[PDB]
Specification:
18 copies of one chain form a homo-oligomer. Chain A has one domain (about 1-69). In chain A, about 0% of the residues lie in helices and about 65% in strands. Chain A is built from no helices and nine strands. Chain A has strands spanning about 1-10, 15-20, 25, 25-30, 35-40, 45, 50-55, 55-60, 65. At the A-B interface, strand 1, strand 2, strand 3, strand 4 and strand 5 of A face strand 1, strand 2, strand 3, strand 4 and strand 5 of B. Strand 2 (about 15-25) of chain G pairs parallel with strand 2 of chain H, so a sheet runs across the interface. The PDB classes it as protein fibril. The entry lists the keywords systemic amyloidosis, misfolding disease, inflammation, prion, protein fibril. It forms an octadecameric assembly. The entry is titled "Amyloid fibril morphology II (ex vivo) from murine SAA1.1 protein".
Chain lengths: ~70, ~70, ~70, ~70, ~70, ~70, ~70, ~70, ~70, ~70, ~70, ~70, ~70, ~70, ~70, ~70, ~70, ~70
């Protein structure tokens, strides 16, 4: 099994990027969540990029190349 | 089993990047979560990049290359 | 089993990067979490980069190279 | 089993980078957590880099190279 | 078993980098945690670098090289 | 078993880098934790570097090299 | 740039399987060659086979098999 | 740049399997060659086989097999 | 740049399997070669086999097998 | 840059398996070569085998096997 | 840069397996060579085998095996 | 740069297995060579075997095995 | 190859009358050349003469004569 | 190879009359060359003469004569 | 190889009349060369003469004569 | 190899009349060369003469004569 | 190898008439060379003469004569 | 090897007429050389003469004669 959580350039309150497995006879309660923003500038940004998501990669040659300037 | 949590350039309150496994007869309670922002500048940023996520990578040659300037 | 938590350039209150395994007859309570920001500049930043996440990497040649200037 | 927690360039209150395993008949309580920021500059930053996360790396040749200028 | 906690360039209050294993009939209480910042400059920073996290590395040749200028 | 805690360039209050193992019939209480900063400059910094974390390294040749200038 | 010479189940006299390269200001003579056979039985024989000649073979998968039953 | 010479199950007299290179201001003579066979039985024989000649073979997987039953 | 000479199950007189290189101002002669066979039984024989000739072989996996039953 | 000479199950007279290099102002002669066989039984024989000739072999895995039953 | 000479199960007279290098202002002669066989039984024999010739072999894993049953 | 000479199960007269190097202003002669066999039984024999010739072998793991049952 | 370089009454910096033959895998560089001449009288002078270039001159009778005066 | 370098009444810096033969894997560099001439009289002078270049001159009778005066 | 370097009445700095043969894996450098001439009379002078370059001169009768005066 | 270096009435700094043969794995350097000439009379002078370059001169009769006066 | 270095009426600094043969794994350096000439009369002078360069001179009759006066 | 170094009427600093043969694993250095000449008359002078360079001179009759006066 493969579990991968990735996060970048974000504003959150709570409860994020959670993994629960192999459980029995459990129980849980979560809390209220409030987000309040006033007068904020130049926030929550990421620059250019690429995203690749896969299970198997086999015999990659001269690939997955990225160039900027 | 593979569990990978990654975080960069973020503003949070709580409860993030959590892994629970192999549990029995458990119980839990979480708390309220508040996020308040006023008058903030140049926040929560990441620059250019790339993301690769996979289980198996086999025989990679001259690849996964990144260039900036 | 492989568990990897990574964090960089962040502002948080609590409860982050948690791993719970192999448990029985347990119980727990968490606390409220507040985040308050006013008048803050040039915060929560990371520069250019790359992210690679995987389980197995086999026979990598002239790869996973990064260049800046 | 492999457990790896890494943190860099962050501002936190508490409860971070926690590992609990092989437990029975346990119980615990956590405390409230407050984060307050006013008038702060040039905070919570990391420069360019790369991140690699994996379980097995086999026969790596002329790879995982990083250059800056 | 392998447990590795690493921290650099951070401002915290408490409860960080904790490992609990092989426990029975235990119980514990944690305390409230407050973080307060006003008028602070050039704080919580790390320079360029790289991060590698893995379980096994086998036959690495001319790799994991980093250059700066 | 391998337990490794590393810390550099940080400002903390308490309760950090803790390892508890092989316990029975134990109990403990922790104290409140406060962090207060006003008017501080050029604090909590680390320069360029690299991080490698692993369990086994086998037959490394001309690798794990770092150069600065 | 290679020279391959393979011979099986032949009846010869001489002057066979020559590779001459990088000759300058040379000179020579080869004599005479007599072959005489009288009354021979069941000679110069080979069984079944598969013959392959090439310069470059890439990424072959589940191929070049021979079965005899 | 190599020279391979392979011979099996041959009846010869001489002057076979020569590799001459980098010769200058040379000179020579080879005599005469007589082959005479009378009344021979069951000579010069080889069984089944597979023959492969090449310069470069890359990333071969589950190939070049021979089965005899 | 190598020279390989392999011979099995041959009846010869002489002047075989020569590798001459880097010759200058040389000179020579080779005599005569007589082969005579009368009444021979069951000579010059080899069994089944697989023959491979090459210069470079890379990353071979589960290949070049021979089975005899 | 090497020279390999291998011989098995041969009936010869002489003048075989020569490697001459780096010769200057040389000179020579080789005599005559007589081969005579009468009434020989069951000579010059080899059993099954697999023959491989190469210069470079890299990262071979589970290969070059011979089975006889 | 080496010279390998291997011989098994041969009937010869002489003048075999020579390696001459770095010769200057040389000179020589080799006599005559007679081979005579009459009435010989069951000579010049070798059993099954696998033959390998190479210059460089790298990172071989679970290979070059011989089984006889 | 070495010279290896190996011989087993041969019937010879003489003039075998010579390694001459670094010769200057030399000169010589070799006589004649007679081989005579009449009525010999069951001579010049070797059993099964595996033959390997090389210059460099690196990082061999679980290989070059011989089994006889 | 015949090479006849002949020079009379000439002035140069360098790189004159060069003969390169039978070269391999060789590289070379020739620096820059300056020729400065000022205030010089009666330079680079050859008297009268005849010039002959040929390969084969057979049965020349009373020919190729130069009568001065 | 025949090389005849001949020079009379010449002025140079260097790099003249060079003959390179039978070279391999060789590299070389030739520095820069300066030739400065000022205020010089009666330089680089050769009297009268005839020039002959050939290879074969057979049965020359009363030829190739130079009568001065 | 025949090399005839001949020089008469010449002025130089260096690097003249060089013959290189039969070289391998060799590298070399030649420094820079300066030739400065000022205020000099009657330099680099050769009287009259004839020049002969050849290889074979057969049955020369009363030829190749130089009669001065 | 025949080498005839001949020099008459010449002025130099160095590096003249050099013959290199049969070299391996050798490297060398030649420093820089200066030739400064000022105020000099009657230098580098050779009287009259004839020049002969050849290899074979057969049955020369009353030839190759120089009659001065 | 025959080497004839001959020099008459010459002026130099050094590095003249050198013969290197049959060298291996050798390295060398030659320092810089200065040749300064001022105010000198009647230098580097050779009278009349003839020059002969050859290899084989057979049956010379009344030839190769120099009659002065 | 035959070496004939001959010198007449010459002026030098050093490094003249050197013959190196059959050397291995040797390294050497030659210092710098200065040649300064001022105010000198009648130097480096040789009278008339003939020059002969050869290898084989057979049946010379009344030849190679120099008649002065």
């Amino acid at each position: 099994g493969f579990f991968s959580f990735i996060g970048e350039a974000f504003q959150g309150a709570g409860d994020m990027w959670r993994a629960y497995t192999d459980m029995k006879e459990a129980g849980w309660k979560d809390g209220d969540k409030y987000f309040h923003a006033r007068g904020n500038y130049d926030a929550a940004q990421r620059g250019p990029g690429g995203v690749w998501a896969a299970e198997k990669i086999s015999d990659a040659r001269e690939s997955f190349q990225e160039f900027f300037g």
